[PDB]
RNA sequence: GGGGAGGUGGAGCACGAGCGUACGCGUUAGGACCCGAAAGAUGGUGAACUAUGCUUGGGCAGGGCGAAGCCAGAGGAAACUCUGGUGGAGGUCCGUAGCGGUCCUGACGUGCAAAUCGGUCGUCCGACCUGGGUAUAGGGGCGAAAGACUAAUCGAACCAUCUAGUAGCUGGUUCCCUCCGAAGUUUCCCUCAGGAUAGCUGGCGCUCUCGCUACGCAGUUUUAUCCGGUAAAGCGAAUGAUUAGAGGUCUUGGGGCAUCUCAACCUAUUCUCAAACUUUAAAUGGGUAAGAAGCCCGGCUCGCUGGCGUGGAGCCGGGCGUGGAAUGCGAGUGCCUAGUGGGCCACUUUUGGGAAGCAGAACUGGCGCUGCGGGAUGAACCGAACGCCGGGUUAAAGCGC
RNA sequence: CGCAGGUGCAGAUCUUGGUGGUAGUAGCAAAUAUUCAAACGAGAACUUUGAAGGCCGAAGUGGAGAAGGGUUCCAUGUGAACAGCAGUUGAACAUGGGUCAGUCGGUCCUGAGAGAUGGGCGAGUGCCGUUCCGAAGGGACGGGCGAUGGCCUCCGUUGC
RNA sequence: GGUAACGCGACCGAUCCCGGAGAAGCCGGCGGGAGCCUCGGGGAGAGUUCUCUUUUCUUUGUGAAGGGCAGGGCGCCCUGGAAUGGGUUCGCCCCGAGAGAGGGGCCCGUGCCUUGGAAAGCGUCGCGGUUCCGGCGGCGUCCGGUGAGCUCUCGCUGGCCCUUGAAAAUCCGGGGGAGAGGGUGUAAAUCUCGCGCCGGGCCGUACCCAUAUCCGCAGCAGGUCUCCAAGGUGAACAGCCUCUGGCAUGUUGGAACAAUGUAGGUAAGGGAAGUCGGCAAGCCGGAUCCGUAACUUCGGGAUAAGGAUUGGCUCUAAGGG
RNA sequence: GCGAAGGCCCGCGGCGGGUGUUGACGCGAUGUGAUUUCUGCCCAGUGCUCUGAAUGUCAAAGUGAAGAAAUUCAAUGAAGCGCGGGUAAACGGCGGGAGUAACUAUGACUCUCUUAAGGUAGCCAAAUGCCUCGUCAUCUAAUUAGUGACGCGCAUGAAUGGAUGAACGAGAUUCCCACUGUCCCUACCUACUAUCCAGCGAAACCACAGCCAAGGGAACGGGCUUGGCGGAAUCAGCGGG
RNA sequence: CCGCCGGUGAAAUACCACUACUCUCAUCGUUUUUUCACUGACCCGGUGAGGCGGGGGGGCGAGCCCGGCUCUCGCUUCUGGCGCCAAGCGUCCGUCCCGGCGGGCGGGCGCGACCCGCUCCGGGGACAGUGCCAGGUGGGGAGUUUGACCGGGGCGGUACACCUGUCAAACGGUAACGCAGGUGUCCUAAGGCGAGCUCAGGGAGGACAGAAACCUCCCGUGGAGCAGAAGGGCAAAAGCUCGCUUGAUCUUGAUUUUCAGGACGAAUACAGACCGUGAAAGCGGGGCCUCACGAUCCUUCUGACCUUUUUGGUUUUAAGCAGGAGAUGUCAGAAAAGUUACCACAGGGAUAACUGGCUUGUGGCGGCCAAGCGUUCAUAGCGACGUCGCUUUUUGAUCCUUCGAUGUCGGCUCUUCCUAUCAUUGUGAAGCAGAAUUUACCAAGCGUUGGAUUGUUCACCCACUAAUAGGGAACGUGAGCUGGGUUUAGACCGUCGUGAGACAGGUUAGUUUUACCCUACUGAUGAUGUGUUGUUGCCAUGGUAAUCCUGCCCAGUACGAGAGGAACCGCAGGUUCAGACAUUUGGUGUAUGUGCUUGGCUGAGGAGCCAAUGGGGCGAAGCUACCAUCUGUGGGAUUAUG
């Protein structure tokens, strides 16, 4: 057989994303002397609109502590921000929606989003529309913090890391119905080559696992293990249930 | 460590025949008599068509419907409703340019054209059409998915090489005359369109034999002597099959009523039968013998056998040619060996099948390999087989034209 | 007389070349259409001029460009071959000639992307990679410290 | 200099820093300007005149770059304080965060006049030399009106988007004030103001751009990216006829008018009886006025279905600046 | 399925690449296919998936023991299988056999077998029904067609989606009005051919060729046998050979 | 007294030392493991590697003790401003000036801006990760395979290795998916020997006892048994019952069967050993005889004072020699699943799917006999039980022709032929009164229709009709059409399959090429001859054509009880077909004839033109329609019959 689909995705040639009017890298600053033992204040120039990613932007500028000149950041906009807004980033900083805080110093309920994974990075959970994260408890022994994260899971993180107060701009994208096969198109012709969708029993067996036969099955059991190669790995991929769910799964 | 006797296994010995060289034929390995695959592999070249993503440009009359928002009026008691305008939404409708390609299964169909032409058709603000630039390259790409497209090539492109790839399969295989002359059958084989094997053929010889100035043999008969269970015949003979009367009677029999008839059994007869039945039993078959390798005398050897001068076998001398049926004929023997290993027809016999110019056997002859006279014509029938000719005569068949 | 062959063809839908019958046959039928006179000329249905009749009917059968072509452009001459009839004609053949820019483009900039070095990988030609594992500046206001040249009291050029 | 918006011919200044321009989608609706078309007159030339037509046809300019003035736009300023709310657009929309009213400011100005400029170009009437003199000369190149007209362009203002519609060279403005200049000369540093002097190298450039210069083996009914776009009819870049321009019927002609064919028509009376099947053809068709069902996701179905009218000529009424 | 030391995927190779300028309202992998109304039962089988291990099997390496060593033996012995779980909008599957209600025919209520459940709601001679042109009605003069019904349905059936349904369709089908050369039954007209001429000028195909009947023959002859017969050179048509 | 001597302690015990199955405690013992911490290898992230960890110093405070002691903190949270390139101090210079110090001019350094400490910061960390080996999973990928025979292949069978009877034609041999059957075993005896008996069945008797219990006599040629199927063989046997045994053992050759006179299997006579049995002669090396089985290579066991183990020697190991065993059933012995409708190649008429040819079971159509039917009566008309034929418009059977291709179902169109005759002409017979009908003869000249449904042939119905007969011609006819069906590739459903996919099931869409060659045929010129040429004519020979029905009258007549109900002559017409023809009606119409009319154009009128025939009305001539009209015929020899 010849390489299905999903093998040659992973060779990035018609399937990379598409990323010539986006904004650049929405993220926190840079961990300095600042953040880590006062604040530092910044003003919101802009609220503008990254293709490809429902969550409105925020270019905040900044004064650089060493030399003279203005630093120009671009955030994933918490929901309230407004520009002309002064937003402040340290361990020193109030608890406000739009500052930038070690999630040590935030107290438990505090609803967070641009969660750091790992200290000093910029931003790397809780950063589509409308998502947050929620500080669990501390533990100021071994200065760890659980978080619970937008799918249900729960994650002990280190104290350091830092988080915007709030929950990301946008909300309820998915609430309205796209309604339209072109509005499909428009949706997926910012974000990558991925949206029309044939069905692997609608192919020939050359091309699909599930493709063939005189009547359009599947044929096999879509339920496939882990360890299957890579173009056999169709399906329900270990799947621990299949079916109408009654209640809530988690682990 | 070396000897003996008696059996068996050896490509051995037993007064060498080989080596070198040339030629011919045969079997193979090699391109391997010549031409022929569908494939496989290794390195490369293509996205000037087309598929999809991206960048940067360009393009899409005129009409219909009339979403939201806004204005005014009428109400009603209010609730709120109704009316007339304005407005210009939509993967909205008609329909140009453009894009596409339904039906005529129209034209053309050695065309204008290796896919075009006409009328009629679908869509025509969108998932729209399009130029250039970019990216993805062959078990790879790309695919709103048809195995579609990837330079007239796609159920893995094209280019060169490995490569003169292999083929039990199809086609072809080049001068003359002379002589000899087949097989389609046996056994083994993933064997059934092929081989190996025996058989049938040819070539080279060789060992002998007869005769003039016989070593022996035979698709024949006869004379002796065995072998057989087919044709026929038989069932008052065995095993099976089977028809009808008759004469008797024990009846763990029945029926109609002291019973009496049936049935049963027995006995003697009677009709009809057998590839897988038989007492009997042909015709045509098959084997052996018809002498010198025989016959008859005398002696020797033996470890075998043994009452014995026994028996059996072997060996050494001697004698006997009326050459021990007919007919015909010169025999024996070695090496190498090609083609063939699809058969078919007829008298008789014969299995399956209603049968067949059907399928399958036996014997002999024939066609195939073969022409000639006759059957008008015809592979096989009847007659007869063939160097080039003259005379004569026939066969089978004929003699109105 | 001997020696040695790439030594004899009717076939192989055999190979190359040549030639018939078909056959003076099929055909020279898509988009309405030509006529009169004259000129040149050996020669005119087809060239040129004039006069008529018609067509494209501005989303043209018009006027200009991009690709691509590469002299096909223009003048003169020829009528051998070609332009599937002719031809005095041609995008044919021959002889000459023709493209002039500071202000129109290229040239410059980046885009999608392509691509070296450092580094890494790799038997290897090489490949991955484009900021990532680099000591990645060769410049400049200005100041100072010296040489040098000038319309040299002074200024400028050149090294640290 | 101006209360201000900002203005005037210049109006010093480095490292450094901030910002702007380059630099932004598609669709709709209005308005301004131009080109084209149109209408009424005046010139010059031409056509028709059998009868009429004071007619019909052609033609009737002012480049860039400066200067001035219209005109368009403005979330620019000053006075002032609005309800009995007012202003205003086709639609909207705007106002105590300052409406209306009055007075200013700025930007664009492709329009008009002007320098260029009539000396040139065109039209027409004549006179020369000789193949060409941009020969010479006379006269003219005028005055108006219209518009949901078409095209281009400049504006304003909206709609749509789970779509928000490049980057970089390059150029400019501002913040700051390290520095420089001269001591009162008729002076200095400095000047994005006016004029004057010198230079701008290399490559492309002819022509076809397609029913004959390109690809399809060819002068091949195929294919191949764009720009400009008159009159009449009419909703129209529809179809039909015409002007500017172009052409010679698409690789030949003459004669005839047979069959069969390809393409286009018509047909009495029936009216799908043909055929697998109404295939093919035919019916209907535009606009105006009426009238429209079942069903329905209430949007539609819908040009449902069905009916009437439609020419020419002569009038009337209404709709404006 | 996945919280990034990750999920899916590429790559001969580098903690090299794509998604990813991304972070669960995201990316990746599947099925069904608007709206409406529903989506029944089965986890035995095959998959996928979770850990209790009572824990059995279980390689290499390591450990110990015997022998002079090579060797041999023993214990230990990961994942996986086994073992117990989930799970059908995973692949799929959804029967009979009895026991029986006052004419029948039909026949709930009870129990059982394989391999777990026995086809629920709906729907149907359907694009799915062999028998079959099923039976009834309607449509016509006449209907193997159409439609509506019926229910033991060879072999319907519920995201291998069931049923329905406005709007839409160069999709398949039946009937009706209108209209007609589709037809009865053909005819006439027009243009371009074909035609003839001047000029130019191919190709396919070709053992030899070319009149029949019967015969026999490789069983359907142009040739052979026996009969019928046979007269130069050609033109336009034609489709038996 | 503790003590075997005492449950007559099953020995069980005082005295002693050992180990035996379990538990616990430990070991500076051994090894293997689990957890926590560290950083330094290794990894990840951030940054322009910009302030990390301690010690401070002062200030902001909070507490505590009577100035300390401990702790905190690092200067920024109303405004959509500004923020750098040091101020200020404290010192050191001038080759510089003006009065050692001062002033001016130009400079330097330190603090402002603390010191020290080894990894820039943070997060993991001996894990992850990498290299090498080992086990699991792995159609994601690769390569390959998927027997043969066969009245085509497949499905089915095994006729593929063996045995019995028959076929089989009296030696032997002899084929078919011929017939009837058996085999992949079974047996320590069912092998071997000896002895002694006689079996199946039947008759007659005997308590329970009977058709079958056991006892006795008699008859018994085997009619029983001998294990497997069948055939042969066998009676003081080879059968039954006992007794003893292992000849079913160890060896070498020869031979038979199949056969090539290789092998295997099986078998036959000997020979040399060692044994069994019996008194002995003898018999016995498996089964009474003909079936019951297996190469090389590899493995495994057994045998020898065996041979090699590579410089020699010893010992393990390994190799060899000989005989058994582990197996190939496709049985002379590859290691092997499917699908292809997306398909490919080499071939085959050695072989299927058409026609044709043989055959005719089946289909269809006839005939003979006569049991009955027909009120009566075998035969008007039929015809049982039987029996003989014909035909090739049924379907089979076969495989001769064609697989380097003979285009395939049906319909449409068109011609000709056959008769086994539906009608019509002429007749014969009847259970023929008339009418209607049935049976048969000559006979194929003429005719045999319009439609609904279906792709259909076939069928069925509706309706006319004289009748609505059956067939052939390569199941006539595709360079004649059509393409509905069947028969490619797209797609759907049901069932089957794990799947790819299959369906002799349904459904929908799906390119129909070429004639100009020869002949045939249709027409058209022409040809040889009569000296040339023309006119008028004759005829050989070939073709051939007419057909059927109404109404009136006969006549309400014959016939008949009635009901009903004809026919010949004659008259008037019509159907089908054929040959012509336009006077008339209709069609056509570009006479481009004459009006009308739209758009445009020639200045307007008049007159015209263009719009591929602009459109429309009416139209001459011509052509043409059962859509008008006209015409269509006589004898001869005879068939069946009388």
Not at 205 to 217: A, C, L, R, Y
Request: hydrophobic residues 35%; proline residues 6%; contains cysteine.
């Amino acid at each position: 057989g010849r390489v299905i689909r999903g093998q040659r995705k992973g060779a990035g040639s018609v399937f990379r994303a598409h990323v010539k009017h986006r904004k650049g890298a929405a993220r926190l600053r840079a961990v300095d002397f600042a953040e880590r033992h006062g604040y530092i204040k910044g003003i919101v120039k802009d609220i503008i609109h990254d293709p490809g990613r429902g969550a409105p932007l925020a270019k905040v500028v900044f004064r650089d502590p060493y030399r003279f000149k203005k630093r120009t950041e671009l955030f994933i906009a918490a929901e309230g921000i407004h520009t002309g807004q002064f937003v402040y980033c340290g361990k020193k900083a109030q608890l406000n929606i739009g500052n930038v805080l070690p999630v040590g110093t935030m107290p438990e309920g505090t609803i967070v989003c641009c969660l750091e994974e790992k200290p000093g990075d910029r931003g790397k959970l809780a950063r589509a529309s409308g998502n947050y994260a929620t500080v669990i408890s501390h533990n100021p022994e071994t200065k760890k913090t659980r978080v619970k994260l937008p799918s249900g899971s729960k994650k002990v993180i280190s104290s350091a890391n830092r988080a915007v107060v709030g929950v990301v701009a946008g909300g309820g994208r998915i609430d309205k119905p796209i309604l339209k096969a072109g509005r499909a198109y428009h949706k997926y012709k910012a974000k990558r080559n991925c949206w029309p969708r044939v069905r692997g029993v609608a192919m020939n067996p050359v091309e699909h696992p599930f493709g063939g036969g005189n009547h359009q099955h599947i044929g096999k059991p879509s339920t496939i293990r882990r360890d299957a190669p890579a173009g056999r790995k169709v399906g329900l991929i270990a799947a621990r249930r299949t079916g109408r769910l009654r209640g809530t799964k988690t682990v």
